């Protein structure tokens, strides 16, 4: 449940001594199918959900406030994530979410499927409340 990018980066940092990238900001997205787990993903829900802008984590804090200080692992979404309402056309089904460094492209940090398969109706919020998206 980790991408090729994060694995290579952390293995290099821990063993070889290569410098480790620091993501500027963390962006969460949705995926109708499982991400390809490599660089990029297949696929983001777009053109069926015209409002799909990746809600930036820690909307207020500059950095270091989006995710709780890890203790023996464990991370959590500090700020509630509320998605823009669906504009229309067809309903979209959401099961996989991906952590993204950039609003578009910019690598894939985590790939984890939601414990429950969920669909988005004509008008809905699909909120990620505090304490969701837990990762060790």
């Amino acid at each position: 449940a980790a991408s090729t990018y994060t694995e290579n980066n952390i293995l290099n940092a821990l063993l070889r001594g290569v410098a480790f990238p620091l993501p500027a900001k963390t962006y969460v997205s949705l995926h109708t199918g499982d991400p390809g787990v490599g660089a990029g993903a297949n696929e983001v829900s777009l053109s069926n959900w015209p409002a799909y802008v990746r809600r930036e984590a820690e909307q207020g804090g500059a950095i270091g406030s989006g995710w709780t200080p890890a203790a023996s692992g464990q991370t959590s979404n500090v700020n509630q994530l509320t998605y823009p309402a669906n504009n229309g056309v067809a309903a979209v089904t959401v099961t996989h979410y991906a952590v993204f460094d950039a609003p578009t492209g910019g690598n894939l940090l985590f790939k984890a499927p939601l414990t429950v398969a969920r669909t988005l109706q004509v008008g809905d919020v699909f909120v990620f409340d505090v304490g969701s998206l837990t990762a060790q």
Binding site: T115, V116, T119, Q121, V125, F126, F128, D129
Partner: peptide, 23 residues
Amino acid sequence: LQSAGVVITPDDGTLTSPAYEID
């Protein structure tokens, strides 16, 4: 009613929920 999740005990394979709606 928002978010919400359905979990089954004999989980793997077998009996899976493709999706759920809220309305």
